[PDB]
Symmetry: D2
């Protein structure tokens, strides 16, 4: 049981919660870390900054097999642009394209069992969809949607039959969340549809499964960066109006992904699964209702 988790930058996101929960099941875990934060992550980890965040309970802490620099906007080394080659954080680093990381993992560890796509990006997220530029829009689809397909395409050859693949989405794909701008809504819409199409292909040709988890709000780094703030309203609305009022943890999403990545979920594929305390089911805020 080896899982590659792409899209860990710190201990505050969904990627860390998935790591944690899978570690609970003695899955070996490999982090794919975006190069602009790689060296920072590695320093904090080496200086024990996350040690407390690695604790599960009395007698298991997390065990991280490897941490690799990983940029899912580049499929192969030939795709790396000149702007990126001329960026100091990327220059120390090698083998950070989807193809390169897949080759490295395979040669180093052999075939793996699970894959987590826990990343997204969009230059113009601050702009509403109507005022998003073409370049901004396509950047969102490239980083947040296409990335999954290419990840699947390069990883299928290094995954065993009956492996499982997970991505994270948001309900803004399906119902309007003002503030979820820059084509991110569009990108999550595509990702949930592509999950179906990929499940057909991965199912039939590889007996590999793929699903997506539509998560509720978490104050991760990426979330707080959208412009108190958007995420703060989102959390507070969720905790007020969700069927289950308890605070939503990265690790609640971690448990469901760990189930979807295991053979326990073997008759589930191509699905969007809501791990959001049931908020998605509500139509009207509850205020007046006695």
């Amino acid at each position: 049981d080896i899982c590659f988790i792409a899209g860990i930058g710190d201990t505050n996101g969904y990627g860390w919660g998935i790591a944690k929960e899978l570690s609970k099941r003695n899955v070996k875990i490999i982090f794919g870390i975006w190069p602009p934060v790689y060296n920072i992550f590695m320093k904090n980890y080496k200086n024990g900054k996350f040690d407390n965040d690695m604790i599960i309970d009395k007698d298991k802490k997390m065990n991280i097999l490897d941490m690799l620099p990983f940029d899912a906007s580049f499929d192969t080394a030939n795709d790396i642009d000149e702007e990126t080659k001329n960026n100091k954080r990327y220059n120390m680093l090698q083998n950070y394209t989807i193809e390169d990381v897949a080759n490295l993992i395979h040669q180093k560890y052999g075939k793996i069992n699970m894959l987590v796509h826990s990343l997204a990006n969009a230059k113009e997220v601050q702009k509403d969809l109507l005022n998003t530029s073409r370049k901004g829009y396509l950047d969102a689809l490239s980083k947040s949607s296409y990335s999954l397909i290419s990840l699947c395409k390069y990883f299928v050859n290094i995954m065993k039959p009956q492996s499982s693949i997970i991505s994270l989405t948001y309900h803004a794909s399906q119902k309007v969340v003002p503030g979820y701008g820059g084509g991110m809504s569009s990108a999550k819409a595509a990702l949930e549809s592509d999950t179906r199409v990929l499940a057909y292909h991965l199912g039939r040709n590889y007996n590999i499964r793929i699903n997506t988890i539509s998560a509720g709000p978490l104050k991760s780094r990426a979330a707080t960066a959208i412009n108190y703030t958007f995420i703060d309203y989102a959390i507070e609305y969720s905790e007020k109006y969700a069927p289950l009022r308890q605070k939503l943890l990265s690790t609640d999403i971690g448990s469901v992904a760990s189930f979807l990545l295991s053979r326990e979920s073997r008759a589930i594929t191509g699905q969007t699964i809501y791990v959001d305390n049931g908020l998605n089911i509500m139509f009207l805020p509850d205020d007046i209702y006695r």
Copy 2:
């Protein structure tokens, strides 16, 4: 405390209830069967003749463990709802406490409060009839037995369940897309069960911190399935094994594994949901003939 599950809708070892039972016991969850009185005795005779002994094996070193088996009719909420004919029925008279209220109270006396509840049952007298030609009594019977029964079970079991408890039912994709042959208001009853799962999840969540979901299952050759009007169930299985993204035979235990996950605390942020456990066949639009190789 400790995990105890009531599974309403076990009439033999060939249905989803038994798969859920088997997967729950795998996880050392205590399990009580709710068995429809018309088939209660036949079930109890086979269980003691050892006829389920082989179906009860989990593996070389594990066997299922059944805490209790009770007569249960989800047609009746209380004793006073029991009609004249059923009273005169000899399959029912030597059996007591089989109304929804009664079985809850009985379970709560013998064992105290439970953690888990599975609704694994449906009935519809005119299932063989198309929806357009299904009578009012036919339609209301389907809704009564397959949809309202879940609501009543919830209502009565809510006060004998611990907080953080979980509830599941089973549904079929016929609710959302047209399956001819799924007659007699069964389609309508699953549509309602899926809608009711959401509304119940709101009320159960806010007031008791209890979760409820439904599993939309692919085809299984259960006793009931073979009672639908080749036969319906054989085409469904054959079609699904041919056209689903995943070609494996769908097993009751595949539903049971997912059920046990939804019933456990690993799914604590999931509620009100319809979860597809059907090898991904729901995601397909057209048959795959021209395209495949």
Copy 3:
């Protein structure tokens, strides 16, 4: 073109709005009027109380072909219960069952081509779903959902091919609306599913189309009989729907009239939202 419109009690509901819009397209309209309110309706009509409400524009007035008593609880006269036999409001009336009304319409005007189901009922609507009784839930399904099926079964043989059928639903079927109790949510969910299954059977065997309009909130008599629920619903919708305009009964009538016509002949089994776009929204807008 002749349309039977089941579920008119007054000018303030969706049925009247549909009637108004159909009459705009020269469709002849037959009202199915629930017996409790039949007398009152015919009295008010006779004394000219609906005369302003019948004007479409200054060159066109609604024309109403007939007004027939109608209770969708009863498939045949054999189904009428003792309580109803003790109701004077019914004892003075005839041919109000689904079977009888279809026969009467067919005997009187021949085959028709449009049918509108604009009705619902549930005795325990004030009770949340969890504390709704079996009798109450089944009542909601019987009156609000099964009634569509039976209306279809009885009208199919007095309808021409290329006919069209419409009912009204609410988004409580698909997303939680607290206060929409009694199993009304369950009934709308069943109606939307049955709309698909009926579309298949009616499509292949009769070349007949059937769809459901999911309407936004309107301050009808039945709505008010449920802040109050309906004023909350309306305020929220007007606060948050993509479109600010007040939702009018005739905005539904306009879509119903399109769906009932040949212009929508490639559309069947569909739930069409006519609600100022409210259904698309996730979160309140305020801070944004």
Copy 4:
């Protein structure tokens, strides 16, 4: 009432069917024609090759207000690349960018009432999703999805009160259609999501409505160019298994588009309306049951 129809390259598509049904309600019609096929269209039209296809009934025939070159690849003139600029079919054409045509329509005809998006393109449609390149994918999203956004953005300030917008999508967005490759599934998924997001911003800022029609299969030039071929299979299945067994015509979609573009439909926005003889509602083939 004036409608601009983006995506008519011949009389065999849904664009033509919409133009026909709108002309039937005396709407004035402007075509946005892709420059690569603009000349041949103008030749064919000028020679009478479309006269029979312009016949509506006994006494009415289509009346076209204008026919303009138009490429939804380019938002403004500054976006046009040098290869395109030198291409023979572009270098005598002008004002064919999204912004330029909007401004041309405006000064030529004043403000308009209706806008139809009836285009799609994807350079790698013959490749299944998993095997689609990043560039192909983004090209599908750029031409088939982002273009709607850009059309909206440049047109809103040239639209009259009570204006309405439609585009055309396909059910492969929601359920798997093998063969609908190249990220077209993805693009249609984006389009349907974006239709909701646009409906919100357009409704609240401009009281403008936008919907999408999910059409059944039509033997158009674009459909034939995909691939039993893909389209012949799709039509055969639709005609055998739809609740309504009848040939699906471009005017069937035209009729719905006309409605949605009109004031009869003013309480409808952000929706995906299925015009497919009810095929979308079916689960499995019908063979056994009958």
